[PDB]
Motif scaffolding. Structure first.
Motif, PDB file in Angstrom:
ATOM      1  N   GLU A  29       8.392   4.093   8.185  1.00  0.00           N
ATOM      2  CA  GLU A  29       9.133   4.770   9.150  1.00  0.00           C
ATOM      3  C   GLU A  29       9.254   4.189  10.715  1.00  0.00           C
ATOM      4  N   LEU A  30       9.465   2.672  10.635  1.00  0.00           N
ATOM      5  CA  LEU A  30       9.956   2.233  11.673  1.00  0.00           C
ATOM      6  C   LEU A  30      11.340   1.538  10.619  1.00  0.00           C
ATOM      7  N   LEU A  31      12.027   1.782   9.847  1.00  0.00           N
ATOM      8  CA  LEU A  31      13.635   1.341   8.864  1.00  0.00           C
ATOM      9  C   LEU A  31      14.098   2.555   9.024  1.00  0.00           C
ATOM     10  N   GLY A  32      13.176   4.090   9.192  1.00  0.00           N
ATOM     11  CA  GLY A  32      14.105   5.451   9.360  1.00  0.00           C
ATOM     12  C   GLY A  32      13.864   6.312   8.662  1.00  0.00           C
ATOM     13  N   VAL A  66       4.854   3.555   3.716  1.00  0.00           N
ATOM     14  CA  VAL A  66       5.515   4.929   4.093  1.00  0.00           C
ATOM     15  C   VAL A  66       5.901   4.587   6.008  1.00  0.00           C
ATOM     16  N   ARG A  67       4.838   3.278   6.527  1.00  0.00           N
ATOM     17  CA  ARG A  67       4.557   2.762   7.908  1.00  0.00           C
ATOM     18  C   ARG A  67       6.316   1.978   8.509  1.00  0.00           C
ATOM     19  N   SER A 116       0.960  -1.186   0.029  1.00  0.00           N
ATOM     20  CA  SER A 116      -0.022   0.277   0.244  1.00  0.00           C
ATOM     21  C   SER A 116       1.126   1.489  -0.049  1.00  0.00           C
ATOM     22  N   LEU A 140       0.159   2.715   2.915  1.00  0.00           N
ATOM     23  CA  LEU A 140       0.326   3.134   4.143  1.00  0.00           C
ATOM     24  C   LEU A 140       1.164   1.978   4.693  1.00  0.00           C
ATOM     25  N   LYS A 141       1.284   0.675   4.321  1.00  0.00           N
ATOM     26  CA  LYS A 141       2.290  -0.346   4.636  1.00  0.00           C
ATOM     27  C   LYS A 141       3.633   0.519   4.151  1.00  0.00           C
TER      28      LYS A 141
END
Ligand SMILES: CCCCCCCCCCCCCCCCCC(=O)OC[C@H](COP(=O)([O-])OCC(O)COP(=O)([O-])OC[C@@H](COC(=O)CCCCCCCCCCCCCCCCC)OC(=O)CCCCCCCCCCCCCCCCC)OC(=O)CCCCCCCCCCCCCCCCC
Ligand SMILES: CCCCCCCCCCCCCCCC(=O)OC[C@H](COP(=O)([O-])OCC[N+](C)(C)C)OC(=O)CCCCCCCCCCCCCCC
Ligand SMILES: CCCCCCCCCCCCCCCC(=O)OC[C@H](COP(=O)(O)OCCN)OC(=O)CCCCCCCCCCCCCCC
Ligand SMILES: CCCCCCCCCCCCCCCC(=O)OC[C@H](COP(=O)(O)OCCN)OC(=O)CCCCCCCCCCCCCCC
Ligand code: HEM
Lengths: 126, 352, 110, 431, 352, 126
Positions: free
Chosen positions: E56-59, E52-53, E47, E49-50
């Motif tokens: 963000e968890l990977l920085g 971006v999320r 997605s 969404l997947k």
């Protein structure tokens, strides 16, 4: 409930006559100074009830500086009555600056509404 | 003040006052439209409510419209009430109250509405852009107030004092007597106006040729050409307009509308071709100017435009009598251009 | 938005007793309405817990009132709360009406 | 890799990035807009615009330099960026026109024109720059009657009574040598820099700036400049945060990065890992908000600053983000902690490493003035990844649970409920 | 596909992919803006969404910007996450899903917001009008979508697989080793793109001189002049820009902004004077062009413009190495003009 | 109450295995034409409850022609249930035009909301 043209015609007949002016204007000055609306920092044209349509049009026709000063004087009256104090002696509204800034607007608005209700019930020659 | 009217034995009359105060003579732009919307507001004696209701009881109506040159205040009434409407027009010219509460409540919403209506139509946008690129700061001021130059009540008051003078206006009428109308424009408040300067200029207004404006717009695409014409070449372009929007030419199926706007100095012949499509407008205006650059015969259109000129001139009472018989041919030279809408698919001036 | 503004009963309770905008300068005379509501609830509650023992005949009315006064547990409390909260109800109501006709809240919008 | 040497007077701090082009030498003083009284205020911005004036900048531009300055709430900086083979020109220009005689800068034509332009741009900032002015009013009411309360640009009423005597007194009282740090970023090596500062004699004064009598103490307050002409409602509330050289500094920045910053119109910021964006996205309660964490010398702030076009549901936005703040103390997870750890490392890397060598000069000058030596990007990353969820919970119970807040608003903010509800919605009854 | 990177001993890297897909190459106007606002959305694998999320968890941070020539797809991350972001950019270049439900929900409100923000500033309107009157339908397409020409989803798909070809794009980055980047761009789905034609043509884009546009706008008024410049005379106008908006002149207090936009083939030197009053715009732009029509000496600004161009070519991936030492003087010839705002109180091109 | 991904999974497993298909689809066809939602002139995907967020987004993502035909079929079913009649034999929805038109939008909307629900309950390895 009493239109301001009625109060205006009664007051102008009292003021422009010589024998009534100097015998009813001192007791009016003492009544205004005894009422104590000047000690809260208020002119009289803030005290007038606003939930007429006439006063609503007269407050929307006010200039944009007198409206801001009027809102500040009302809010300062609310706060200095909330504290159950009075304003200090330097911030009382002096008698020289209790000018009617709203009364020409209310007189023109009530004259417009009176002319409207006079024209709606007109009778042509029968 | 040259009051002069005509008579016919009928019932309904009209009486018009034409001042020279349109967008041509506006100091700031949008002033004249605000004065025109300010016209039939309250005076110093009676209101704008009493006048409307009392004149409805007396059998008539008022109007106030604004062309590029004139502001005309019109009153249509029954014939037995002439002096009341003369005194009403005299009062509304002399002593309008000019109140700020009547500026912001009643006049600015009407001006905003009329500007929104004349902006949502792309033909008037093309027409005023063509005016503003032909004549720059003379006739080409914008007709309606849009808020670009901020104008408040003092400029409207000073412009009304500039333009509502005695030797600036004229008084016309249909179905009134002339003698008692001349007696009723006196005995009144219209002769006590300040005898100011006339505003009409006798010079021809310094046009510019070969200029192009391209304005982006959502909706329909308009290609408009515009030719400033002199006072000697008025008949030739009038018969050209009435030859182009008629069945005599091959071009009225392409041309939406072409019209010559006349003035005392010269005029402006504008030609608007519009559609939803833009390649249609492209091929159409290219065919129009590529055929008009050749010579066109203007001989079969003469009697037809005599008809159209009579039916256009009987309405107004300032008729400019063209003789329509020194016309032989037409050949297009230099022309201003304006493209409104889907501009990137519309042709440029050196492509035409 | 918040649950106290979304749920239909809680939106009513919110808009009436939580974030109903009251004027900033009202003094202690405007609390008489809250006092009247509390005292009305007091009258209703003690009246129900007395009407569970009051019998309304002509041979048992006064005898049942003095049976409430003497034999039921804490019945003297209930009868004196009713018979005195009625008097306090009417005195706070007279204060409510006198505030209303002194401060001009019979006037044009209410 | 960020080497610092103390000379006879000044402290030299530098970092040599040999791949960058424009080497940038300047001096960073440790006396910002919180080292004065509220009557000579704006003399720091006036000194900055005197240094950046037409005379000084034409003299610097004829030789091939480009001036820079930055006034903050404890440090102020004067940076002369330049080409890499030309920094002795930078050093002797900064000597000859700022550190020695300034009589060419401080006569009443250049000072009059500079004061007039400063007055015009300060009143243009006060009228037409709305989120920065409410962050400034937040600073002015949080630390009030206490020297950290001052406006950085200065107020208009305390700027029309300033003459050259005020600027000369401030340059005698705060432009010292036990207060200054000279910095070099870009691609100058360290020893040619100090070789050129020790060849030509460069020393401003000898003394010490006056120490303040009142330390920065937070006072929980409230202010509202409600102007209902404006189309939005810019409010910002903040609690006392941890200052610089505090052990709970990086956990304050991490707790800010937990809630992040948002922008309602970009479709890539509407999909973040914040739990607040499932509450404020079904009625569109705000347009943007950013959770800052400012850390000055004595104390600092911690809060969010928003802007709202939906001016009726302001209290719902306040209440939702304050319940999200209480989620830090009671039930913060670990995936939020690791997401904020990686995002905080990304943000500090974007701040410390960038193309412009004057921002690195300002940051290096500040954190060598206050600390003594610059901690690297590696040690900061290690101190970031050494943070557990329980350290965030302990800090949030220390500084966020039922603490005093300070609010600063403008615009259409009658829908903002007044103070005691916002203060006592910082603590919920455990749901 | 040219992979051009460089190394540094720091922590934060960036990877960018530049395609030649700005409004220079848009078929309908506003299509490149819809593709740029369309870029980092739902792939056929995962997605928006997947991505971006988990990034963000990977920085890291994705971004996609748009100017007149390129579309830039940037990704800023920690250094040890290179192959995931290479595969993410290759995913989003190859197989975006292109759904109407996300065209209306997510792309069109962002395009409407970006167009309203760029409209409410009166200097960007003058800049793109200056482009549209200098270059007609080359570089002069508007940058942002505005609802004039209706763009479908099929036009976006056709433009996307016209521009997202392998010879058109090139991949650069900061703080990545070239070996691992060249090994991760291969063994990927960035190498299996269609190997279409490169879109840049290198001859000069056929400018037009001596043209004026007048835009009506409420707010603050700007006046902008614009000179289309060649590839040989790029240095003289760059020195002129860094001389005009600098303290070497006495014309720095009048000029609000002045900048040279550089391209492969030539450039455009533009100059904006903005004020709230408009007589000051008239007198300021009259003084500016009346002093620039005399000869200015540009050799004192050479070292300063070498500094400014070093610091502005610091982080761009397209360094043009101009000489700046064949520059001696400047004398203005013919120039395009655009006047935005209070348009009746602004001077025309004949007045300047 | 039951997610459409689960209904689609159980239905796909019933369909594409040939032992269960020839036993389950004839009684399903008899249950559908015994239900009687086609005698009112309705497809099945009008009958689904439209008061979930999933169904609301799946309706707002519907194309403009099928939305208008859907609104007409719902209104016509309302009217011919009001008059307590049925639609005539010409205006019955035939079995070949009982195509699932809302089901791809329902499946992708619930897949998106489901992926959001398990992306914000994710845990890194600790
Ligand atoms: C008449 C006066 C009406 C006052 C209304 C009020 O105070 O509400 C303001 C305030 C509004 O908060 P909010 O802005 O909705 O904040 C919501 C957040 O989630 C933050 O809100 P929160 O989570 O802090 O509040 C949730 C609250 C909600 O509690 C309940 O709804 C059930 C309470 C039982 O939970 C509790 O109150 C737990 C304490 C239970 C009290 C036990 C001892 C008393 C026994 C009775 O709600 C409360 O403080 C609760 C007051 C207690 C409930 C009213 C009990 C009335 C019984 C008759
Ligand atoms: C009676 C005891 C209280 C008397 C009293 O305190 O009167 C003084 C106040 C003055 O009124 P105030 O609102 O304070 O105005 C002054 C405010 N300054 C201008 C100073 C800021 O006046 C008031 O406080 C108003 C109180 C009047 C109503 C309460 C008295 C009720 C007694 C029973 C009345 C029964 C009426 C039956 C109606 C059917
Ligand atoms: C059991 C405890 C559960 C606590 C859960 C919780 O904390 O309730 C939090 C909720 C608000 O939650 P929210 O809007 O933040 O959620 C947002 C999710 N999207 O408040 C409530 O439910 C009730 C509000 C309490 C205040 C009003 C109380 C009125 C009581 C009735 C009195 C009537 C008398 C007059 C008639
Ligand atoms: C139109 C008018 C109609 C009538 C309107 C209603 C009038 C109500 C009159 C009766 C008052 C009810 C009191 C409720 C108190 C409350 O509920 O306390 C809610 C508050 C919420 O405080 P907080 O969290 O915001 O801040 C607080 C700081 N964080 O908890 C408290 O402080 C607890 C205080 C003690 C509560 C018990 C007090 C005695 C109550 C029983 C007796 C009631 C009689
Ligand atoms: C409006 C509120 C009420 C008022 C003002 C009110 C007032 C009174 C008064 C003054 C009495 C007489 C007390 C005495 O003997 O001196 C009384 C009696 C009584 N009331 Fe009420 N009352 C109210 C509501 C109620 C209600 C709702 C009930 C029933 C549930 C109730 C039950 C009784 C009973 C049973 C008595 C009998 C005598 C006694 O035991 O006090 N009351 N009431």
């Amino acid at each position: 409930p009493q239109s301001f043209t009625s109060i205006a015609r009664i007051g102008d007949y009292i003021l422009k006559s010589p024998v009534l002016s100097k015998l009813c204007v001192p007791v009016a000055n003492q009544f205004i100074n005894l009422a104590g609306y000047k000690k809260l920092g208020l002119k009289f044209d803030d005290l007038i009830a606003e939930e007429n349509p006439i006063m609503q049009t007269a407050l929307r026709r006010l200039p944009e500086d007198e409206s801001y000063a009027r809102a500040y004087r009302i809010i300062r009256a609310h706060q200095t009555e909330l504290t159950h104090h009075l304003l200090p002696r330097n911030e009382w509204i002096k008698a020289q600056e209790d000018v009617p800034y709203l009364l020409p607007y209310i007189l023109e608005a009530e004259a417009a509404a009176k002319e409207k209700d006079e024209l709606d019930n007109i009778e042509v020659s029968k | 003040l040259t009051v002069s009217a005509r008579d016919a034995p009928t019932k309904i009359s009209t009486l018009a006052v034409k001042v020279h105060g349109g967008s041509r003579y506006a100091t700031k732009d949008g002033v004249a439209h605000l004065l025109n919307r300010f016209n039939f507001q309250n005076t110093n004696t009676r209101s704008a409510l009493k006048l409307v209701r009392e004149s409805e009881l007396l059998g008539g109506t008022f109007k106030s419209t604004l062309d590029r040159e004139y502001i005309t205040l019109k009153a249509t009434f029954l014939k037995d009430d002439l002096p009341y409407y003369v005194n009403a027009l005299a009062d509304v010219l002399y002593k309008t109250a000019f109140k700020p509460h009547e500026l912001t409540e009643s006049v600015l919403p009407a001006a905003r509405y009329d500007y929104a209506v004349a902006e949502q139509c792309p033909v008037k946008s093309a027409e005023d852009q063509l005016y503003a690129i032909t004549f720059r700061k003379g006739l080409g001021n914008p007709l309606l107030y849009d808020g670009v130059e901020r104008v408040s009540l003092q400029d409207i008051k000073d412009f009304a004092d500039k333009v509502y003078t005695k030797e600036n206006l004229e008084v016309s009428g249909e179905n009134v007597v002339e003698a008692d109308l001349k007696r009723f424009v006196d005995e009144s408040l219209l002769s006590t106006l300040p005898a100011g300067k006339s505003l009409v200029s006798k010079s021809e207004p310094k046009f510019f040729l070969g200029e192009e404006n391209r304005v982006r717009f959502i909706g329909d695409s308009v290609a408009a050409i515009g030719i400033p014409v002199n006072k000697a070449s008025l008949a030739q372009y009038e018969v050209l307009a009435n030859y182009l929007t008629s069945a005599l030419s091959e071009l009225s199926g392409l041309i939406s509308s072409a019209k010559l706007d006349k003035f005392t100095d010269g005029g402006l012949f504008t030609l608007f071709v519009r559609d939803q499509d833009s390649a249609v407008v492209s091929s159409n205006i290219k065919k129009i100017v590529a055929d008009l650059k050749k010579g066109k015969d203007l001989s079969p259109a003469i009697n037809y435009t005599k008809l159209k000129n009579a039916v256009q001139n009987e309405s107004v009472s300032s008729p400019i009598e063209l003789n329509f018989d020194a016309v032989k041919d037409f050949k297009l030279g230099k022309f201003n251009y304006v493209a409104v809408g889907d501009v990137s698919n519309l042709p440029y001036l050196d492509e035409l | 938005m918040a649950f106290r503004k979304s749920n239909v009963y809680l939106s009513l309770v919110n808009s009436y007793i939580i974030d109903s905008p009251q004027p900033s300068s009202i003094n202690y005379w405007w609390n008489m309405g809250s006092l009247l509501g509390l005292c009305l609830v007091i009258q209703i509650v003690t009246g129900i817990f007395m009407a569970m023992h009051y019998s309304s005949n002509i041979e048992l009315a006064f005898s049942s009132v003095e049976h409430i006064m003497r034999d039921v547990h804490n019945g003297y409390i209930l009868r004196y709360l009713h018979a005195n909260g009625a008097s306090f109800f009417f005195m706070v109501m007279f204060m409510h009406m006198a505030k209303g006709l002194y401060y001009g809240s019979y006037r044009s919008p209410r | 890799a960020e080497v610092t040497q103390l000379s006879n007077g000044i402290v030299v701090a530098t970092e040599h990035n040999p791949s960058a082009h424009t080497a940038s030498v300047g001096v960073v003083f440790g006396s910002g807009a919180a080292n004065e009284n509220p009557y000579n205020n704006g003399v720091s911005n006036l000194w900055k615009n005197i240094f950046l004036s037409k005379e000084n900048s034409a003299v610097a531009a004829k030789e091939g330099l480009a001036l820079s300055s930055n006034i903050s709430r404890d440090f102020q900086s004067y940076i002369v960026s330049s080409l890499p083979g030309s920094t002795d020109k930078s050093l002797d220009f900064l000597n000859q026109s700022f550190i020695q005689q300034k009589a060419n800068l401080l006569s009443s034509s250049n000072f009059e024109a500079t004061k007039k332009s400063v007055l015009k741009q300060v009143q243009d900032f006060e009228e037409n720059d709305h989120p920065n002015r409410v962050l400034e009013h937040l600073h002015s009411t949080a630390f009030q009657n206490t020297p950290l309360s001052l406006p950085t640009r200065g107020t208009l009423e305390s700027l029309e009574n300033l003459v050259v005597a005020d600027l000369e007194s401030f340059a005698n009282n705060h432009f010292l040598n036990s207060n200054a740090v000279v910095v070099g970023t870009g691609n100058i090596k360290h020893e040619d820099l100090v070789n050129s500062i020790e060849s030509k004699n460069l020393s401003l004064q000898t003394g010490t700036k006056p120490v303040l009598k009142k330390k920065a103490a937070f006072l929980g307050s409230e202010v509202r400049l409600r102007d209902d002409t404006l189309p939005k409602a810019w409010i910002s509330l903040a609690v006392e945060g941890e200052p610089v050289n505090s052990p709970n500094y990086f956990v304050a920045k991490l707790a800010a990065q937990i809630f992040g910053s948002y922008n309602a119109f970009e479709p890539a910021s509407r999909l973040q890992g914040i739990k607040l964006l499932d509450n404020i996205q079904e009625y569109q309660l705000c347009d943007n908000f950013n959770h800052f964490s400012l850390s000055y010398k004595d104390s600092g702030l911690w809060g969010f600053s928003t802007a709202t076009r939906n001016v009726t549901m302001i209290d719902d936005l306040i209440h939702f983000t304050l319940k999200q703040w209480n989620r830090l103390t009671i039930s913060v997870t670990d995936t939020e902690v690791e997401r904020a750890k990686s995002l905080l490392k990304l943000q500090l890397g974007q701040l410390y490493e960038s193309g412009n060598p004057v921002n690195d000069a300002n940051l290096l000058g500040a954190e060598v003035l206050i600390k003594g030596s610059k901690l690297s990007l590696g040690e900061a990353f290690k101190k970031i990844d050494a943070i557990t969820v329980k350290d965030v919970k302990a800090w949030a119970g220390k500084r966020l649970w039922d603490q005093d807040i300070a609010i600063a608003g403008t615009g259409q903010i009658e829908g903002l409920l007044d103070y005691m509800r916002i203060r006592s919605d910082m603590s919920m009854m455990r749901w």
